[PDB]
Amino acid sequence: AVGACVLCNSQTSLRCGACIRRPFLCCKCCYDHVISTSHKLVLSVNPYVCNAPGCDVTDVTQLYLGGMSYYCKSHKPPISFPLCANGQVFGLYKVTDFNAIATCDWTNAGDYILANTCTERLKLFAAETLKATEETFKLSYGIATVREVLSDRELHLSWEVGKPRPPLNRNYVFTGYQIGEYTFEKDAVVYRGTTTYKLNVGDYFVLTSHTVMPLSAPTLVPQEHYVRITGLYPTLNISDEFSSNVANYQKVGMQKYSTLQGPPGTGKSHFAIGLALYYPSARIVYTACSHAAVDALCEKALKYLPIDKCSRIIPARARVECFDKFKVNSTLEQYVFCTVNALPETTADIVVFDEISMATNYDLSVVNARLRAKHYVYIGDPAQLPAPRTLLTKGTLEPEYFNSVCRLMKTIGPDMFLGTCRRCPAEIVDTVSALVYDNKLKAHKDKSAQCFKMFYKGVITHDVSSAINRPQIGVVREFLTRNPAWRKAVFISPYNSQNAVASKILGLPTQTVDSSQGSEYDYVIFTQTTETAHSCNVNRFNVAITRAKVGILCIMSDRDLYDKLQFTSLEI
Ligand SMILES: [Zn+2]
Ligand SMILES: [Zn+2]
Ligand SMILES: [Zn+2]
């Protein structure tokens, strides 16, 4: 019952009982909270409630200290002090932004803006409160009791009446009943059990509600600049392959943390792994939120770093298959490849945090909490996709509010910028360079003359809310008959249900924009599907068209993004 004031650190016995996280508040700040919000329950060793038998007054503003106990106006003795007076709440050791964070429901973009422009201790309160709210919201959805099992990849479901039905995408991972995690796709539904199990009829699914642990460490440790490379020993023999990155590698050694903005195909993996070869004795933990981001860092390490000094950390509650060519769960190897949520408690010379646009402030804090390191390197791109905010339905979250690193990158600039895209035909590089990189991204490749755009609104049907555009798929089917080189193309759209239809009609492999992030393919076919905020988001569009190494076909719904594409227009 004794702790520090989440606003000014001052010791107190006073927690707010109305805040979902029950933060410790000092007398001066607990007042400014209760007097300006619907929050009136103040906890101590014992709650600030009327001690009179049967009295239900819990509002600290209506309570008084009578000797040792607390009473309301109706019950207090003649000699009694009001608990709230003179800008304080009586406690031992005797905020506008804190109020907005503490009370918001996290459905509005402005909630995320504030959780990212506030003080550092408020960024942790914000992140804890948000994640708790996200988790206690999951308790508010319908169960899917299995009616019948068609095959090993399809079954039918009966849905609980009175509670809403959650979106059936790869984003929403259920828990079967403890028959392991289970996802679904687009009355025949496509079931995907993490553990292979002959699905029993009557068995029920419920969503994976995890307990939100408190945060302690800041999002970003305080910044230190050094005169010389600190606690790292560079090679003199550095392979020409990594000669480009030498000055940035010395920058990494000469400050506590560094930010690298690398646009698509600019050499992020190359940079991350090239750091190990430039500081060859340095212990490096390689971390990202997703298994796929960590597995990409593994593939690059496999090519350049000795395989005996590399470990892939895999949590015993295995969710999806991941990188299988390192020693598994050897925490003490020089090179450790681990998702944030599985990180062990250890130390390092360098921590490399990759795909930083997908990190939340909760993720940034957990890393600083589990890994004590001489240098933190933050790699990603604020022009790429953020983590989905399940509760955010109103307003759009701008890149400068994704997390503390993206905010730094969007305000003061990144410490290091990889400025040459080596993956994409020039037509794509020129488009995104102007769209999201203020003309600072340069093309290595020539124009491919295999980058095509077509303006075709088509017809938009919906599977619930997920959009489908069959005529857009029809246009692709026609294009494929005349363009056999594209038979190998990955189909990409902003919608699962569009992808499900494209899968059956075209037989192409299928990716959402969001699942395509970090991947590259020779040929991409993109159907915008709709002109919504979701399908027109410049970050999503940037990711969509930068997957392609040789050619891209964009069937567009939005005039603006269509006119911006520096592609050959097709007719029909
Ligand atoms: Zn305070
Ligand atoms: Zn409160
Ligand atoms: Zn009373």
Curated annotation (Swiss-Prot):
Localisation: Host endoplasmic reticulum-Golgi intermediate compartment
Residues that bind Zn(2+) 12: C16, C19, H33, H39
Start and end residues of each (+)RNA virus helicase C-terminal domain: 419-572
Effect of substituting S36P: In strain: Omicron/BQ.1.1, Omicron/XBB.1.5, Omicron/EG.5.1
Phenotype for M213I: In strain: Omicron/BQ.1.1
UniProt LRR repeat ranges: 208-228
Binding site for a ribonucleoside 5'-triphosphate: G262, P263, P264, G265, T266, G267, K268, S269
Catalytic activity from the UniProt record: ATP + H2O = ADP + phosphate + H(+)
Outcome reported for the amino acid change (mutating Q88H): In strain: Iota/B.1.526
Coiled-coil segments on the chain, per record: none
Stretches assigned to the (+)RNA virus helicase ATP-binding domain: 237-418
Record: residues binding Zn(2+) 11: C5, C8, C26, C29
Domain CV ZBD: 1-105
Residues that bind Zn(2+) 13: C50, C55, C72, H75
Function: Plays a role in viral RNA synthesis. Multi-functional protein with a zinc-binding domain in N-terminus displaying RNA and DNA duplex-unwinding activities with 5' to 3' polarity. Activity of helicase is dependent on magnesium. Binds to host TBK1 and inhibits TBK1 phosphorylation; the interaction with TBK1 decreases IRF3 phosphorylation, which leads to reduced IFN-beta production.
Assembly notes: Interacts with nsp8 to form the replication-transcription complex (RTC): nsp12, nsp7, two subunits of nsp8, and up to two subunits of nsp13. Interacts with host TBK1; this interaction inhibits TBK1 phosphorylation and decreases by 75% IRF3 phosphorylation, which leads to reduced IFN-beta production.
Protein's UniProt name: Helicase nsp13
Species for this entry: Severe acute respiratory syndrome coronavirus 2 (2019-nCoV)
